[PDB]
Design an enzyme around this catalytic site. Structure first.
Site, PDB file in Angstrom:
ATOM      1  N   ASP A 166       0.700  -1.191   0.040  1.00 33.73           N
ATOM      2  CA  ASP A 166       0.015   0.005  -0.021  1.00 33.73           C
ATOM      3  C   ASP A 166       0.982   1.126   0.010  1.00 33.73           C
ATOM      4  O   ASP A 166       0.640   2.191  -0.595  1.00 33.73           O
ATOM      5  CB  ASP A 166      -0.793  -0.010   1.292  1.00 33.73           C
ATOM      6  CG  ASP A 166      -2.258  -0.775   1.076  1.00 33.73           C
ATOM      7  OD1 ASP A 166      -2.507  -1.108   0.091  1.00 33.73           O
ATOM      8  OD2 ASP A 166      -3.185  -0.325   1.910  1.00 33.73           O
ATOM      9  N   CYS A 173      -2.543   0.682 -13.626  1.00 32.61           N
ATOM     10  CA  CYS A 173      -2.523   0.526 -12.188  1.00 32.61           C
ATOM     11  C   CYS A 173      -3.624   1.653 -11.577  1.00 32.61           C
ATOM     12  O   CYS A 173      -4.733   1.374 -12.401  1.00 32.61           O
ATOM     13  CB  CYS A 173      -1.263   1.030 -11.465  1.00 32.61           C
ATOM     14  SG  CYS A 173      -0.219   2.514 -12.262  1.00 32.61           S
ATOM     15  N   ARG A 191       3.398   2.583 -10.926  1.00 29.37           N
ATOM     16  CA  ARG A 191       3.743   1.316 -11.131  1.00 29.37           C
ATOM     17  C   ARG A 191       3.902   0.804 -12.456  1.00 29.37           C
ATOM     18  O   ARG A 191       4.617  -0.127 -13.102  1.00 29.37           O
ATOM     19  CB  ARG A 191       2.505   0.335 -10.420  1.00 29.37           C
ATOM     20  CG  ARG A 191       2.949   0.635  -8.865  1.00 29.37           C
ATOM     21  CD  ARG A 191       1.704  -0.092  -8.018  1.00 29.37           C
ATOM     22  NE  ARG A 191       1.303   0.416  -6.872  1.00 29.37           N
ATOM     23  CZ  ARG A 191       0.508   0.155  -6.114  1.00 29.37           C
ATOM     24  NH1 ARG A 191      -0.472  -0.800  -6.324  1.00 29.37           N
ATOM     25  NH2 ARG A 191       0.155   0.415  -4.873  1.00 29.37           N
ATOM     26  N   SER A 192       2.812   1.258 -13.395  1.00 24.84           N
ATOM     27  CA  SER A 192       2.887   1.274 -14.792  1.00 24.84           C
ATOM     28  C   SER A 192       3.980   1.241 -15.852  1.00 24.84           C
ATOM     29  O   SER A 192       4.555   0.948 -16.336  1.00 24.84           O
ATOM     30  CB  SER A 192       1.392   1.772 -15.435  1.00 24.84           C
ATOM     31  OG  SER A 192       0.078   1.197 -15.165  1.00 24.84           O
ATOM     32  N   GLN A 236       6.495   7.806 -10.601  1.00 20.31           N
ATOM     33  CA  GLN A 236       6.144   8.917  -9.684  1.00 20.31           C
ATOM     34  C   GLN A 236       6.702   9.459  -8.303  1.00 20.31           C
ATOM     35  O   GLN A 236       6.507  10.704  -7.844  1.00 20.31           O
ATOM     36  CB  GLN A 236       4.756   8.572  -9.210  1.00 20.31           C
ATOM     37  CG  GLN A 236       3.516   8.414  -9.962  1.00 20.31           C
ATOM     38  CD  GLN A 236       2.007   8.004  -9.589  1.00 20.31           C
ATOM     39  OE1 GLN A 236       1.875   6.824  -9.094  1.00 20.31           O
ATOM     40  NE2 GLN A 236       1.266   8.794  -9.511  1.00 20.31           N
TER      41      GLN A 236
END
Ligand SMILES: COc1ccc2c(c1)OC[C@@H]1CN3C(=O)CCN3[C@@H]21
Length: 282
Positions: A181, A215, A221-222, A262
């Protein structure tokens, strides 16, 4: 510089935030005018994540052709990817319309439906064989065929039917279920194992349309997934694998979608994945 020793040099000097901010400063800025039209407000999850006009995927529809999705075309590596946001309640039919029209074989999902106690994307695929889904706005039917649950990821076989023509196709759903998370994984081993399972399926290969990867926003994440894949492929293709420059590859990918990677932690994790992966390949 090479990668593994540039890596230790940034760790010892603690400068990951400065490296990452340089990337943010140098990244491309292209218009995203279609994304910002008022009629598309409920088609975007986040107001600050939009596809560029020049690389956006168009739906084959005359009313409204807009979806929050981008084509990342890597010329030297000879790989293409579609990066998109997690589907919203009012875009699940558009999502499967895109999969159909772009001739994709695989969908790569890097988030859970609920994370941090909030919804990160719609439940857009069926959970039981006998309870299929019909998307009336785009005239598609979607059926769960089989499901294989493993410790870090799940693979599903799905049947997508175009109800207008009665044509059917098999789609593979690759779901990485264990990204934490908060933060990034401590080791890249399970993420690399997952990448290799997607590769082994044919879903990334030129005989199919581009893989669809998402994502929640489709940039973090992508971005890590496609950046690691392309860098490893270039290391196999070139005479000198130490010439592969992960920052230069990331800036190339940011010509096609904003915001890829990010956080500085995601940047460090991408370096780690490519470094460890290059040892297993040989
Ligand atoms: C450090 O953790 C890993 C785990 C898995 C792999 C790896 C590193 O490096 C590249 C290897 C190539 N290989 C396959 O073809 C199947 C998985 N495996 C890859």
């Amino acid at each position: 510089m090479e990668m593994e020793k540039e890596f230790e040099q940034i760790d010892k000097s603690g400068s990951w935030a400065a490296i990452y901010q340089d990337i943010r400063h140098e990244a491309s800025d292209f218009p995203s005018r279609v994304a910002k039209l008022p009629k598309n407000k409920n088609r975007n999850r986040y107001r600050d994540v939009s596809p560029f006009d020049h690389s956006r995927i168009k739906l084959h529809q005359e009313d409204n052709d807009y979806i929050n999705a981008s084509l990342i075309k890597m010329e030297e590596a000879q790989r293409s990817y579609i990066l998109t946001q997690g589907p919203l309640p009012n875009t699940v039919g558009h999502f499967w319309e895109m999969v159909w029209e772009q001739k994709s074989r695989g969908v790569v999902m890097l988030n859970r439906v609920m994370e941090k106690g909030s919804l990160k994307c719609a439940q857009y695929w069926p959970q039981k064989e006998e309870k299929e889904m019909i998307f009336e706005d785009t005239n598609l039917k979607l059926t769960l065929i089989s499901e294989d649950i493993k410790s870090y990821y799940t693979v599903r076989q799905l049947e997508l039917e175009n109800l207008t023509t009665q044509e059917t196709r098999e789609i593979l759903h690759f779901h990485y279920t264990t990204w934490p998370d908060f933060g990034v994984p401590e080791s890249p081993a399970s993420f690399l194992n997952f990448l290799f399972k997607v590769r082994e399926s044919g879903s990334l290969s030129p005989e199919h349309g581009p893989v669809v990867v998402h994502c929640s926003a489709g940039i973090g994440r992508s971005g890590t997934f496609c950046l690691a894949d392309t860098c490893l492929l270039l290391m196999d293709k070139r005479k000198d694998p130490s010439s592969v420059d992960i920052k230069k590859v990331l800036l190339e990918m940011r010509k096609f979608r904003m915001g890829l990677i990010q956080t500085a932690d995601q940047l460090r994790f991408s370096y780690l994945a490519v470094i460890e992966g290059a040892k297993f390949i040989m």
